[PDB]
């Protein structure tokens, strides 16, 4: 099968900033 798009992981950035600072 085909992989999903790299862009389908974009929301991890928001998750990251939930738990960690810049």
């Amino acid at each position, epitope marked *: 099968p085909l*992989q*999903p*798009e*790299l*862009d*389908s*992981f*974009k929301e*991890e*950035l*928001d*998750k*990251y*900033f939930k*738990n*960690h*600072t*810049s």
Partner: antibody
Amino acid sequence: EVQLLESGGGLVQPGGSLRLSCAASGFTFSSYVMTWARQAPGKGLEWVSAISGTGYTYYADSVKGRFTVSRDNSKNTLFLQMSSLRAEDTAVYYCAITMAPVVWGQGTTVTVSS
Amino acid sequence: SYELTQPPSVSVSPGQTARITCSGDALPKRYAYWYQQKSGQAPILVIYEDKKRPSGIPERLSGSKSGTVATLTISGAQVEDEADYYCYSTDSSGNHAVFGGGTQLTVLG
């Protein structure tokens, strides 16, 4: 404290191989895409590769077929296996978190030369 | 290969507003991201998802996107803002990411 510790860079002859490593701590590593980027001396940033937590892999056209990205979630480590190295692969190589690099490693220098 | 187009150089007077553009055919459907790199340093993310500001980044820095053009706006420019700024996004397929060529910001005076 989030830490990305890179290793594995060095001088390699063209056609040689190198394995870069990025040991992560301070976050749930298996929850995140990890990204490789690079910067040649005096040039711009270039996206190299990315791997999702569950192992989906993505590659720049300039390295596809020569580089393999991998990860070990149990050891919180990201790898870039480089093969068929060319002069144009000379660069500082960075690992970073998520598909849009948010926290960057400090880099490891790869020099491809005879 | 999908590419993002940035001007190589932008200059701004102290206290004025710098606008750095980044054009690409997939930008109407793909988020833009912006990085700041000062000489001899690793890059820092300054804008994500067109317009979101990471905590700690100055409010003077903002991002916007319209059509095929994303813009990083730096208002009240200070000498400390001199750096190379790179936009970053993904292609129409969504399977590759790419940086723009970078824009060197010069603060005049």
